[PDB]
RNA sequence: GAUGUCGGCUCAUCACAUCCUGGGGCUGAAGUAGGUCCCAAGGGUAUGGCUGUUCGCCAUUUAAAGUGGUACGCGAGCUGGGUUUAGAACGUCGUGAGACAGUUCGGUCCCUAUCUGCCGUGGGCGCUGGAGAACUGAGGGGGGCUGCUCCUAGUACGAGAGGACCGGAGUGGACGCAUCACUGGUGUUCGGGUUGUCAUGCCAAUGGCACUGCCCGGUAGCUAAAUGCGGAAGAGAUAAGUGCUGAAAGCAUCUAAGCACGAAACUUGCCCCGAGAUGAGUUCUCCCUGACCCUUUAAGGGUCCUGAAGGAACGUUGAAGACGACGACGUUGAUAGGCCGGGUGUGUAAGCGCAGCGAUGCGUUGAGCUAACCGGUACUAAUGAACCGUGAGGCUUAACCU
RNA sequence: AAUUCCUUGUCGGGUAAGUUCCGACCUGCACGAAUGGCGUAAUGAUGGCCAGGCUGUCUCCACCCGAGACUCAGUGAAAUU
RNA sequence: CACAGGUGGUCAGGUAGAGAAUACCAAGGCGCUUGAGAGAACUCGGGUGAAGGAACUAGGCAAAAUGGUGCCGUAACUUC
């Protein structure tokens, strides 16, 4: 199977509408230091719940 | 629980523990359309799947030359009667090699207890 | 006359007083409650919107609650309409019970069955395996051919191919009713139901001989 | 197609995942503190936590058993003696996992886990 | 079960002591038969002074399966070794005088008495 | 300038010049069963030996094992069995090289789907304020097969043999859908037996490897060979056919008017999808009730505050699933994991003491272990949050309310 | 017949059923005696046939174990047009 | 090509094994320059499968089955 004529490049911008990305808006507020970080994660610090969980 | 509920109230509560390889004797109700008699049946249990309401139990008799192998329910009605006159000595749950090696030569033993 | 809507638990043989062995499936069903009554100068025909199990408050938001609470009937799992034989009539917020399915004898159960997923040919349309040896290459559960030459030149519609199975409506009928429990809720069917044990059920009226 | 299945594959067979898994438990078990992907600390679960519930009961046929997973002595030796009385209290749940992101070199999704208290 | 191209046996003394099952019986496209069929079978060796030959093909009945028979109750009989009775091509009438081995139950129900009378068992 | 040919496997579709089932006419149609002709394609339409064979002969069933088209259907679906490039041999022709619609052996079947086509599943937008649900149905799709027995009835017919039409009730084969209640299979995540070797210092006991080292069973799930159901009945309009009355044509006539039957043929009736049905449908419920400025002064624009219902995202997950999507739950929780109890499976764990020189057995013990299954248990993980989604929803006409 | 178009030559065995095979006849288009005729033990990754065990080759496919196929992260072609 | 290919000679341990075969180890050398998730159709390499056992196919193709030692015993033909 190959290819008889060949596309333009209206049908591949057409074909790529769907592999936009996402991107996230709301990842998190930490309560004790105010850093962003990913839900359900532990920050840059390893802050999470306000407790430290990693002790460097 | 809700199956269970059902499965209860079906149980039989005359129903004899038998260990796996002994001589069970298994009495069944046979119907000709008009009239119920008892069946007996001589034969060694090979196979136990005790499992709720679904309990069955596999014995083999050997008659007329030829093997034969039939199950049971242990809550059915059909039965009548379980009796179990010698308590064989196998180690193992299941007796399904007793189908290859000859009745002669697969003589079982009794546990001694 | 109307039927239930139940909730499949089990199913589980049942032993007669001959010995025979009767296979049931066992179907909890709650006491559904009338949510809408239509009519034919509002809707245009008649049927009646009821409901079954309970829901977490939680869960519900606001446009059901309201509705529920308009007929006066608490939280709901589901939300289902069962069309009249012209001439019953239902009230709403009504409960319906269960011991009037004892002289029908015979029910109709639809569900939704179990999901296969992307299943292959073979499994979908019961195809025939082609042969494992003799110099085949690549090829043992494919479909094969799937048209003709160039002179129709396009793939027919409807043809057989592999596809997803399962989440679908599913419906048997002529399933004979065995016994039906008042004080438990419970009822017993003959035969084998669609769907996987806890998934909803709805049960109706054999509508053939 | 895991209709009520469970039991994860992690690309590998048999042999290999009850090897992994076994490592992975004695380096926790020694350790405390492990960072690896979400799903193999989910698996790891199944494994360390009936093993510290076995190891709750102190007994020869008891320490034997535990010998016959993680192949060592000196695993067991830590076992029956140190997390034995801090866990006898406690009813599931020793171990639990937090998540810290993805790794830089094949973007797989990271976790620590470790132990209800640590003793720290 | 039972179906084309199987290794039987004989559950009486016509003469035969090894018979093909080479057809079934019953309608199109029969694929299996149970514990009581109508089935083509062939002589594969039988006693010379048997009441059969060697080549002969005749009708015959089902005795034993080795799968099992299904009864009401959820019971299967299971057997070691799987024979069949002689039959006559034109009517359906044995052959054999006695039969060697257990019978089911079944026959009765499809109107098979002959065998049921003269077999000293079930 | 090229694998592309015949046959076989899978997959089928269409026509009726119909093989059966269905409705009839005539008959040299007593009946069953037969011959011919008409309508009718809804469904079904075989297994093996020989040969590569299509076709055929043979053996045995059925209602039959239909005729043809679709590049003598289908090789970017499979087979290379025939013929057949390169080798060789047999018989014939030619002095010969070589040839032979004469015969035998052996002799590379590529391609990651761009588009249309088909099967499933998703994202955006629209349906004119937004959102959550539940339904009618324009349309489309799936199936429409029947053998045998009994009663009618050994009745009608028939000298007897033979043997009814219609109707009713059961029981079979194939197909499709559903399920794991039983029977099994698998069940390399459960237990046990055993060989060689290595290691835990050593005895015992375990662990790795040797196809899961080789076997025996076996949880859940899946599955069929296992068991539940279906092929309708009925209604409307009809083909052939049978008709009533009835003139043209004083008779006659199924037709010129009118009326009444009539098939597995058509539409409903059985099941499924289905308002993108842009002709964008119907019903219920919920939420939003501020201010100011500017321009070309109108479905105008701009600023502050407000962020409702709901949606979105993340985590736990699933008998939902390729990814999407769907379903349940998120502290006001049993969603997943762990634990307890129970069940199931395997089978008498290790250690102790005794008997036996020893192997081994014995009481402890139907003990130990037990994965996916059942009922409970916040012990752990599902954070307080934040984002999107608004401020009453155009014009004209018609009926009422002032 | 490695040779026969008539041919599936005629008969028998093998099989329920054998255009294959074997055994008898020669109507040798177009076998034939060193471009050798007949037989021949053993031998042959040689052609054909039959029998016994064995099995998913099939009836009729089902489940399970791994590697790809599916998603994410990085690198990143092709024939054809 | 940092290529599942080929390349001559020497050193030749233990266990069990007739053996340089085979299975595990000694010293020694490596885990093979892309990883992480879920376990769809389908493909490849395998394990097992109730009943029949070649009925599929041109063809027992592939699969499946036997497989060693010691003892007994072993046909037609034949150049013995």
Not at chain 1, 21 to 29: D, E, I, K, P
Not at chain 3, 159 to 181: C, F, H, I, P, Y
Not at chain 5, 96 to 114: N, Y
Request: glycine share 10%; hydrophobic share 35%.
């Amino acid at each position: 199977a190959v290819q008889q004529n060949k596309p333009t490049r209206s049908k591949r911008g057409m074909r790529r509408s769907h592999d936009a990305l996402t991107a996230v808006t709301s990842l998190s507020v930490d309560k004790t230091s105010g850093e962003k970080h990913l839900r359900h994660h532990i920050t840059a610090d390893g802050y999470y719940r306000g407790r430290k969980v990693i002790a460097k | 629980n809700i199956i269970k509920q059902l499965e209860q109230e079906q149980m039989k509560q005359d129903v004899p523990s038998f260990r796996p390889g002994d001589t069970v004797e298994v009495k069944v109700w046979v119907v000709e359309g008009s009239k119920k008699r008892l069946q007996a049946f001589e034969g060694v249990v090979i196979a136990i799947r005790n499992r709720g309401l679904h309990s069955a139990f596999t014995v083999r008799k050997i008659s007329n030359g030829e093997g034969v192998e039939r199950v049971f329910q242990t809550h059915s009605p059909v039965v009548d009667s379980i009796s179990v006159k010698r308590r064989g000595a196998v180690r193992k749950a299941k007796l399904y090699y007793l189908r290859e090696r000859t009745g002669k030569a697969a003589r079982i033993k009794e546990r001694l207890n | 006359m109307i039927g239930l809507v139940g909730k499949k638990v089990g199913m589980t043989r049942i032993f007669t007083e001959d010995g025979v062995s009767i296979p049931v499936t066992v179907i909890e069903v709650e006491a559904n409650r009338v949510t809408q009554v239509k009519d034919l100068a509002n809707d245009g025909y008649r049927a009646i919107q009821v409901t079954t199990g309970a829901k977490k408050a939680n869960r519900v938001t606001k446009p059901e609650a309201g509705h529920f609470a308009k007929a006066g009937v608490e939280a709901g799992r589901g939300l289902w309409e069962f069309r009249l034989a012209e001439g019953e009539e239902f009230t709403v917020g009504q409960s319906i019970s269960v011991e009037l399915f004892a002289d029908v004898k015979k029910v109709d159960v639809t569900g939704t069955s179990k999901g296969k997923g992307f299943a292959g040919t073979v499994k979908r349309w019961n195809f025939r395996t082609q042969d494992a040896t003799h110099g085949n290459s690549l090829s043992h559960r494919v479909p094969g051919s799937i048209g003709q030459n160039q002179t129709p030149g396009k793939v027919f519609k409807g043809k057989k191919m592999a596809g997803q199975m399962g989440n679908e409506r599913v419906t048997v009928q002529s399933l004979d009713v065995v016994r039906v429990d008042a004080e438990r809720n419970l009822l017993l069917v003959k035969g084998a139901v669609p769907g996987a044990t806890g998934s909803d059920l709805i049960v109706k009226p054999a509508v053939k001989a | 197609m895991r209709h009520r299945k469970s039991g994860r594959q992690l690309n590998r067979n048999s042999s290999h995942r009850q090897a992994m898994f076994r490592n992975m438990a004695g380096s926790l078990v020694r350790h405390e503190i492990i960072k690896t992907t979400l799903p193999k600390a989910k698996e790891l679960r199944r494994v360390v936590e009936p093993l510290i519930t076995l190891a709750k009961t102190d007994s020869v046929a008891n320490r034997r058993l535990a010998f016959a997973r993680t192949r060592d002595n000196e695993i067991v030796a830590k076992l029956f003696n140190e997390l034995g009385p801090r866990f006898a209290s406690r009813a599931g749940g020793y171990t639990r996992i937090l998540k810290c992101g993805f790794r830089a070199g094949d973007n797989a999704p990271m976790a620590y886990i470790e132990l209800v208290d640590r003793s720290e | 079960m039972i179906q084309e191209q199987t290794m039987l046996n004989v559950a009486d003394n016509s003469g035969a002591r090894r018979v093909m099952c080479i057809k079934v019986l019953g309608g199109s496209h029969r694929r299996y038969a149970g514990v009581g069929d109508i089935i083509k079978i062939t002589i594969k060796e039988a006693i010379p002074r048997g009441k059969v030959k060697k080549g002969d093909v005749l009708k015959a009945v089902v005795v034993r399966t080795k799968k099992g028979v299904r009864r009401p109750d959820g019971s299967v009989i299971r057997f070691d070794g799987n024979a069949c009775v002689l039959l006559n091509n034109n009517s359906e009438q044995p052959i054999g005088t006695r039969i060697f081995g257990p019978v089911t139950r079944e026959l009765r129900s499809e109107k098979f008495m002959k065998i049921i009378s003269l077999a000293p068992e079930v």
